[PDB]
Amino acid sequence: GLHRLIYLSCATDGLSYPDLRDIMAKSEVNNLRDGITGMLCYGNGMFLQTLEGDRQKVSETYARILKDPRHHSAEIVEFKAIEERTFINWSMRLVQLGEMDSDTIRRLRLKYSPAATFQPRSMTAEQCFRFLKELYDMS
C-alpha cells in the first residue's frame, strides 16, 4: 500500500556542500528506482524529510538512511498509509532554508512550531507535514 514517512535528524559536524549534492544525487536515483518521492529540508543544522511510496521500499530506504554518518540522532515523526501522494513532483527535492527569503521562512517556521529557530523536534507530525507541504508548493 501507499505510505508516507516523516522523520528528522541532526546534521553531523562537517557537512559540506558536496555532501548535500552527493546525498541528493543518490536519493534521486534510488527513489526513482523504488517508486519513492519526497522532499528534504535542511536548516539550522537540522534535517526534516518526508518519503512517500511502498511500505517495504520506504522502510528499506529509511534503514539505509540511518547508516549515513552525515547525520545522527534520527527521530521518526510519522508513518502511516495515505490515499494519495502529496509530494508528487520530485524523486527527492532538497530545500535549504538558509537560501529562502528570511521573512517567508521565519513566518512559516513560526506558523507550524513554537520555536525561535527551525527545530523539528518541537513539532508534531501534522506540523511537519504542513510545513513541508508549503515548502513543496513554493518549489
- Identify residues after which the chain is interrupted (C–N over 2.5 A): none
Known binding positions for FAD: 26, 30-31, 49, 64, 68
Region near its own copies per CB under 8 A, out of 18-26, 42-50, 66-74, 92-100: 66-74
Considering the rule CB under 8 A, would residue 11 count as an interface residue with its own copies?
no
Cell numbers for 136: 513543496
Considering the rule CB under 8 A, would residue 1 count as an interface residue with its own copies?
yes
Angle of CA points 102, 87, 83, to nearest 5°: 140
CA distance readout (Å), 106 to 82, 87, 94, 111, 131: 29, 22, 18, 8, 12
Considering the rule CB under 8 A, would residue 85 count as an interface residue with its own copies?
yes
Residues near ligand FAD (CB under 6 A) are: 9, 23, 26-27, 30-31, 38, 40, 47, 49, 51, 61, 64-65, 67-68, 70-71, 92
